[PDB]
Each structure stands twice: as C-alpha cells, then as structure tokens.
Coordinates of C-alpha atoms and ligand atoms in Angstrom, one line a residue:
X1 CA 0.1 0.0 0.0
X2 CA 2.6 2.3 0.7
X3 CA 6.5 2.4 0.8
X4 CA 9.0 2.7 3.6
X5 CA 12.0 4.2 1.6
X6 CA 14.7 5.3 4.3
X7 CA 18.0 7.0 4.1
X8 CA 21.3 4.2 4.2
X9 CA 23.7 5.9 2.4
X10 CA 24.9 9.3 1.4
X11 CA 28.0 9.1 -1.5
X12 CA 30.0 12.4 -1.2
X13 CA 32.6 13.4 -3.9
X14 CA 31.8 15.2 -6.9
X15 CA 32.8 18.7 -6.7
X16 CA 29.7 20.3 -8.7
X17 CA 25.8 19.8 -9.6
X18 CA 25.5 16.2 -9.6
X19 CA 22.9 15.1 -12.9
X20 CA 22.2 11.1 -13.2
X21 CA 22.7 8.3 -11.4
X22 CA 22.2 5.3 -13.1
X23 CA 21.8 1.1 -11.5
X24 CA 23.5 -1.5 -13.7
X25 CA 21.3 -3.6 -15.3
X26 CA 22.6 -6.4 -12.9
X27 CA 22.4 -4.2 -9.9
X28 CA 25.7 -4.4 -9.3
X29 CA 26.8 -0.6 -9.2
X30 CA 25.5 2.9 -9.5
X31 CA 26.7 5.2 -11.8
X32 CA 27.1 9.2 -11.7
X33 CA 27.8 12.3 -13.6
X34 CA 28.2 15.7 -12.9
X35 CA 29.0 19.5 -14.0
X36 CA 32.4 18.6 -12.7
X37 CA 33.2 16.7 -15.5
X38 CA 33.2 13.2 -14.0
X39 CA 31.4 10.0 -13.8
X40 CA 32.1 8.0 -10.6
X41 CA 31.1 4.4 -10.2
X42 CA 30.1 3.4 -6.5
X43 CA 28.4 -0.1 -5.4
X44 CA 24.4 -0.3 -5.0
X45 CA 24.7 -2.2 -2.5
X46 CA 27.3 -1.2 0.5
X47 CA 27.6 2.7 -1.1
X48 CA 31.0 2.5 -1.2
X49 CA 32.4 4.3 -3.6
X50 CA 34.6 2.4 -6.9
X51 CA 35.9 5.2 -9.5
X52 CA 36.2 8.2 -10.9
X53 CA 36.0 7.7 -14.8
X54 CA 37.8 11.6 -16.4
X55 CA 37.8 12.8 -20.3
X56 CA 35.1 14.8 -20.9
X57 CA 36.4 18.8 -21.7
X58 CA 33.2 20.5 -20.2
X59 CA 30.9 18.5 -17.2
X60 CA 28.2 15.8 -18.5
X61 CA 24.6 15.0 -18.8
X62 CA 24.2 12.5 -18.7
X63 CA 24.9 8.4 -18.1
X64 CA 23.9 4.9 -19.1
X65 CA 24.8 1.5 -19.4
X66 CA 25.2 -1.1 -22.0
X67 CA 22.6 -4.5 -21.1
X68 CA 26.0 -6.7 -19.8
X69 CA 26.8 -3.8 -17.5
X70 CA 29.2 -3.6 -19.0
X71 CA 29.7 0.0 -21.9
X72 CA 28.5 3.0 -20.4
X73 CA 27.8 5.9 -22.6
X74 CA 28.5 9.6 -21.5
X75 CA 26.5 13.1 -22.9
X76 CA 28.6 16.3 -21.7
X77 CA 28.3 20.3 -22.5
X78 CA 32.1 19.3 -24.9
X79 CA 29.6 18.4 -27.3
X80 CA 30.7 15.1 -28.0
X81 CA 29.1 11.8 -26.0
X82 CA 32.2 8.9 -24.8
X83 CA 31.6 5.2 -24.6
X84 CA 33.5 3.9 -21.7
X85 CA 34.9 0.4 -20.5
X86 CA 33.7 0.6 -17.1
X87 CA 36.7 -1.7 -15.6
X88 CA 39.3 -0.4 -17.1
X89 CA 37.4 3.7 -17.0
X90 CA 39.0 4.4 -20.8
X91 CA 37.2 6.4 -23.5
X92 CA 36.8 3.6 -25.8
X93 CA 34.6 6.2 -29.1
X94 CA 34.6 9.5 -28.5
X95 CA 31.3 10.4 -30.7
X96 CA 31.7 13.4 -32.7
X97 CA 28.4 15.1 -34.7
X98 CA 26.3 17.1 -32.2
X99 CA 27.3 20.9 -33.2
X100 CA 25.7 22.3 -28.8
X101 CA 25.8 20.7 -25.8
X102 CA 24.6 17.2 -25.5
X103 CA 22.0 16.3 -22.7
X104 CA 20.6 13.0 -22.9
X105 CA 22.2 9.1 -23.7
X106 CA 20.8 5.4 -24.2
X107 CA 22.2 2.6 -25.2
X108 CA 19.7 -0.1 -27.2
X109 CA 19.0 -3.4 -25.5
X110 CA 21.0 -5.4 -27.7
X111 CA 24.0 -2.2 -27.6
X112 CA 24.9 -2.6 -30.7
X113 CA 23.2 1.1 -30.6
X114 CA 23.2 4.7 -28.7
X115 CA 20.3 7.3 -29.1
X116 CA 21.3 11.2 -27.4
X117 CA 19.5 14.5 -27.6
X118 CA 21.1 17.6 -27.8
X119 CA 21.0 21.2 -27.1
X120 CA 21.7 21.4 -30.6
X121 CA 17.6 19.9 -31.3
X122 CA 18.8 17.0 -33.2
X123 CA 18.6 13.1 -31.8
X124 CA 21.8 11.3 -33.4
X125 CA 21.7 7.6 -33.0
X126 CA 25.1 5.9 -33.1
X127 CA 26.7 2.3 -33.5
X128 CA 28.2 1.4 -30.5
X129 CA 31.1 -0.6 -32.9
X130 CA 32.3 2.5 -35.0
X131 CA 31.0 5.5 -33.2
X132 CA 30.5 6.8 -36.0
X133 CA 27.1 8.2 -36.7
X134 CA 23.9 6.4 -38.0
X135 CA 21.2 8.8 -38.4
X136 CA 20.1 12.3 -37.2
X137 CA 16.8 13.1 -36.3
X138 CA 15.6 16.9 -37.1
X139 CA 13.0 16.0 -33.6
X140 CA 12.2 19.6 -32.8
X141 CA 12.7 22.6 -32.9
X142 CA 14.4 23.3 -29.2
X143 CA 16.8 21.6 -26.8
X144 CA 15.9 18.1 -26.8
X145 CA 14.9 17.0 -22.7
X146 CA 15.7 13.2 -23.3
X147 CA 16.1 10.4 -25.5
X148 CA 15.0 6.7 -24.7
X149 CA 14.4 3.2 -26.2
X150 CA 11.1 0.9 -25.9
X151 CA 12.0 -2.6 -24.4
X152 CA 13.2 -4.0 -27.6
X153 CA 14.9 -0.4 -29.2
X154 CA 12.4 -1.0 -32.7
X155 CA 11.2 2.5 -30.9
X156 CA 13.7 5.9 -29.6
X157 CA 10.7 8.6 -27.1
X158 CA 12.1 11.7 -27.8
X159 CA 11.5 15.0 -24.9
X160 CA 11.2 19.3 -25.9
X161 CA 11.0 22.3 -24.4
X162 CA 9.3 22.8 -27.9
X163 CA 7.0 21.0 -26.3
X164 CA 5.9 18.3 -27.8
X165 CA 6.9 14.2 -27.2
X166 CA 7.8 12.1 -30.1
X167 CA 7.6 9.0 -31.0
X168 CA 10.7 6.9 -33.8
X169 CA 10.7 3.8 -35.9
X170 CA 14.3 3.5 -35.2
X171 CA 15.4 1.4 -37.9
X172 CA 14.0 4.4 -40.4
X173 CA 14.4 7.3 -38.6
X174 CA 11.1 8.5 -39.3
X175 CA 8.1 9.6 -36.6
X176 CA 5.9 7.7 -36.0
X177 CA 3.8 9.9 -33.5
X178 CA 3.4 13.1 -31.8
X179 CA 1.4 13.1 -28.5
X180 CA -1.4 15.8 -28.9
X181 CA -2.1 17.9 -26.0
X182 CA -1.6 23.5 -24.4
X183 CA 2.7 22.8 -24.7
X184 CA 4.8 23.7 -21.8
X185 CA 8.6 22.3 -22.5
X186 CA 8.8 18.6 -21.8
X187 CA 11.6 17.8 -19.7
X188 CA 11.6 15.1 -19.1
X189 CA 10.1 10.8 -21.3
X190 CA 10.8 6.7 -20.8
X191 CA 8.4 4.1 -22.3
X192 CA 7.1 2.2 -19.4
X193 CA 8.8 -1.3 -18.8
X194 CA 6.2 -2.5 -21.4
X195 CA 6.4 -0.4 -23.6
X196 CA 3.0 0.3 -23.7
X197 CA 3.0 3.7 -22.3
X198 CA 5.0 6.8 -21.8
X199 CA 6.5 8.8 -18.9
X200 CA 6.5 12.5 -19.7
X201 CA 7.6 15.6 -17.2
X202 CA 6.8 18.6 -18.4
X203 CA 7.6 22.4 -17.0
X204 CA 4.2 23.3 -15.0
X205 CA 4.6 21.0 -12.4
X206 CA 2.5 18.3 -14.3
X207 CA 4.0 14.4 -14.4
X208 CA 1.6 12.5 -17.6
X209 CA 1.3 8.8 -18.1
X210 CA 0.3 8.4 -21.7
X211 CA -0.3 5.1 -23.7
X212 CA 1.2 5.9 -27.2
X213 CA -0.7 3.8 -29.1
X214 CA -3.9 5.3 -28.3
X215 CA -1.8 9.1 -28.4
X216 CA -4.3 9.6 -25.2
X217 CA -3.1 10.8 -21.2
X218 CA -4.1 8.6 -18.6
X219 CA -3.4 9.3 -15.6
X220 CA -1.4 13.1 -13.8
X221 CA 0.9 12.9 -10.8
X222 CA 0.9 16.4 -9.6
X223 CA 1.9 17.9 -5.5
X224 CA 5.1 18.7 -6.3
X225 CA 7.1 21.2 -8.5
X226 CA 8.7 21.0 -11.2
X227 CA 9.0 24.1 -13.3
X228 CA 12.7 25.4 -13.9
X229 CA 15.0 22.1 -14.4
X230 CA 14.4 18.1 -16.5
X231 CA 13.8 16.1 -13.9
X232 CA 14.6 12.4 -14.1
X233 CA 10.9 10.0 -14.3
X234 CA 11.3 6.6 -12.3
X235 CA 8.7 3.1 -12.6
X236 CA 9.0 1.5 -9.4
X237 CA 8.6 -1.8 -10.6
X238 CA 10.7 -4.7 -8.2
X239 CA 7.9 -3.8 -5.0
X240 CA 4.9 -2.2 -5.1
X241 CA 4.3 -0.3 -9.0
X242 CA 5.2 3.3 -8.2
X243 CA 6.1 6.6 -10.0
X244 CA 9.2 8.7 -8.3
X245 CA 10.9 11.7 -9.1
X246 CA 12.9 13.8 -7.8
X247 CA 11.4 17.8 -7.1
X248 CA 13.1 21.5 -7.4
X249 CA 11.6 21.2 -3.1
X250 CA 14.9 19.1 -2.5
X251 CA 12.2 15.8 -2.5
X252 CA 11.9 12.8 -4.1
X253 CA 8.1 12.4 -4.5
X254 CA 6.4 9.0 -5.2
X255 CA 3.0 8.2 -6.5
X256 CA 0.9 4.8 -6.6
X257 CA 1.1 4.6 -10.8
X258 CA -2.9 3.9 -10.6
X259 CA -4.6 6.3 -8.5
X260 CA -2.4 9.1 -8.5
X261 CA -1.5 9.3 -4.9
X262 CA 1.9 10.5 -3.5
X263 CA 2.7 7.7 -1.0
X264 CA 5.5 8.8 1.1
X265 CA 7.8 11.7 0.0
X266 CA 11.4 12.2 1.2
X267 CA 13.2 14.0 3.0
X268 CA 17.2 14.9 2.8
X269 CA 18.1 16.6 0.2
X270 CA 19.4 20.5 0.5
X271 CA 19.6 21.4 -3.6
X272 CA 16.9 19.9 -6.6
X273 CA 16.6 16.9 -6.6
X274 CA 17.4 16.2 -10.7
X275 CA 17.7 12.9 -10.3
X276 CA 16.2 9.7 -9.2
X277 CA 16.9 6.0 -10.4
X278 CA 15.1 2.9 -8.9
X279 CA 17.5 -0.6 -8.6
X280 CA 16.3 -3.4 -11.2
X281 CA 15.5 -6.5 -8.2
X282 CA 15.7 -4.7 -5.0
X283 CA 13.4 -1.7 -3.8
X284 CA 16.4 1.0 -3.5
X285 CA 15.9 4.1 -4.4
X286 CA 18.7 6.3 -6.3
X287 CA 18.9 10.3 -5.6
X288 CA 21.3 12.9 -6.6
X289 CA 20.8 16.6 -6.8
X290 CA 22.5 20.2 -7.7
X291 CA 25.6 22.2 -7.0
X292 CA 24.1 22.9 -2.9
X293 CA 24.0 20.1 -2.2
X294 CA 26.5 17.6 -4.4
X295 CA 25.7 14.3 -3.0
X296 CA 24.2 11.0 -3.4
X297 CA 21.5 9.0 -1.5
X298 CA 20.9 5.4 -1.5
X299 CA 16.8 4.5 0.1
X300 CA 15.9 1.4 1.3
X301 CA 12.2 -0.2 1.5
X302 CA 10.8 -2.9 2.5
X303 CA 7.6 -2.8 -0.3
Ligands
0BW401 C1 17.5 23.8 -21.5 O1 17.9 22.8 -21.4 C2 19.3 22.2 -20.8 O2 19.7 23.4 -20.5 C3 19.0 20.9 -20.0 C4 18.4 19.8 -20.1 C5 18.7 18.2 -19.8 C6 19.5 18.8 -18.9 N1 19.3 17.9 -18.2 C7 19.6 16.1 -18.7 C8 19.4 14.4 -18.6 N2 18.9 14.0 -16.2 C9 19.9 13.1 -16.4 C10 20.3 15.1 -16.0 C11 19.8 17.2 -17.0 C12 20.2 19.4 -18.0 N3 21.1 18.7 -17.6 C13 21.3 19.7 -16.7 O3 19.7 19.7 -16.1 C14 22.7 19.5 -15.5 C15 22.5 19.4 -14.4 C16 23.2 18.9 -13.4 C17 25.1 19.1 -14.4 C18 25.0 19.9 -15.7 O4 26.5 19.0 -15.6 C19 26.3 19.3 -17.3 C20 23.8 19.4 -16.2 C21 20.3 21.2 -19.4
CL402 CL1 12.9 0.5 -35.9
CL403 CL1 4.5 -1.2 -17.5
CL404 CL1 6.7 -0.2 -27.4
CL405 CL1 16.1 3.8 -13.3

C-alpha cells in the first residue's frame, strides 16, 4: 500500500552539481555524472566509492549503461558523447557530430546502438562498434531533454522544450507519432517497462502517463515542484507499482501509479533533486541533487 524508503547512504565526492544516477542492469553498480566533468562508480548495496572515470572537457548531463553492465555512455557540454569501458576506465570512442551541448543518452537493449539528444535540437543514432553517427533526426525545434529506447529498441521516444513528445521508428528514423496535448516544455520522457506507456514530465509541475498506441493521457501525477529543471522520473517495479521523481522543493516524490496518490516524500537533500533511479531487483532508490548539495543518496524500502 505505501513504501517506507529510509536513508541508507549519502555518497559524497562530486565537486559540482550531480546530473544523473543510473543502476547497472546487473544491479551491482551505481554510475553518477556531474557538472564537475566526472563519472563516478559506486557499489549499489554498500554505497562504497569504486572509481572516477575522466576525459570529458566540460560538464556531463547524463550517463547510461550497456545491457551487459560493461559499458557506459556519457553526454557532455563538450558537444560529445563518450563510450567507456567501466572495468578499465578507458574511453573507447568519442562520438562527434552534435553542434552544441549533449543532454541525454541511452543504449538500446542489444547495446549495438546509442541514442542522444542535444541543445542543437537533433536526436542522433550512433553505432557503438564504429563510434560513427548512423542517423541524424531533425527531431525538435528547441533543446532535446530526453531520449529513450523501448523494450526491444524498435522505437525511440524524445522530448523537447518545444513542448512536444515524439516517437521514432529506430530502423528508418521516421517519426511515428507526436503526442497531442498546451505545449509547456517537455523536460523528461521514458517508455514503461512493457513499452505500452510513456511517462512524460512538463515544466508546469506535472507528470503524465500516456498510452502510446491510443495517443491518450491515462494518468496525471501532481503535488511536486517542477518548473525549471529537467528532472528524471521512474517506474518503480520491484515492490509496489510506483512513479518516482525528484522535485525542486528538494524532496523525492513517490506516487501510486494507478491511483495517482502521493504515497511517500523523501527528505534529506539540500538542493533540487534532479535525478532518481530505481534498482532493477531490490526496493532501492538512488537520488542526486544540484550544487548546494552535490551528494547522491541511497534509500531502501520493505515494499
Ligand atoms: C535547455 O535544456 C537544458 O539546459 C538541459 C536539459 C536537460 C538536462 N538534463 C538531461 C539528463 N538529466 C539526467 C539531467 C538533466 C540538462 N542538464 C542539467 O540540468 C544539468 C544538471 C546538473 C549538471 C549538469 O552538468 C552539465 C547539467 C540541461
Ligand atoms: Cl525500428
Ligand atoms: Cl509496464
Ligand atoms: Cl513499444
Ligand atoms: Cl530507474
């Protein structure tokens, strides 16, 4: 009915705002990225700092794992993405093509591809092996805030400050759908685990669950504050079925997915919680905050 997330660890080390936290698909690791130009790896269960991965010339907005938990991709203000071998810490490829800040990135399920979104208003599809750009989608007319592959990688969902959420056929690069809604900036977008729904944040303090096939809004989640930052949200699926998001009032919000009620609010951070991640098997949340805080928090619940 209601989760009971409690603080287990506070992870200090970043020297500027943290931008993104992600659990490795194998559950073993947390990766974090920051305005400090660094990627850090931490033990998911003991919160133990593992290593720092460096190479970007400017700050990093996003980081994402390959399906085998061996590779990471990062998205940076230096206009590049970098592909990293986590075990060695080495940059395997630098992905060059965007003409401004890169804000978001993801591997596909196979992990032969990377998708990216940029201030330059494009979505790019990259070949992991060669490090070359396969497709450039003229996706939006303002900065791209988020990009995400569906369950099998056949679709890409993108969001933008232009107020649109668009769905793309990965193979052809063709737009399959623009969600019909007002047009406040769409600050975040993610497919549901089954690929049927899309969770979308807009900068009017609102999260929406969309039915992809129908192009219809099914659920709305409110009560939090989100009018300025591109705050990441999540489907929590290991215990109760929740929606999880950071907020500009420094809290982590948790809603019941079906009823839309706020079921928990997590207090502790001292700046905007820009990023949250949900562990793939345990009832564990990671959260991260902006420059007044600079820490990552790990929380655990019984359900
Ligand atoms: C006009 O659009 C933007 O300026 C913009 C959009 C999305 C961003 N992301 C996208 C990915 N999230 C995980 C983090 C926030 C970000 N990145 C950040 O807000 C951000 C936060 C902390 C550190 C950081 O270092 C570059 C960047 C910026
Ligand atoms: Cl496809
Ligand atoms: Cl689902
Ligand atoms: Cl789908
Ligand atoms: Cl997650």
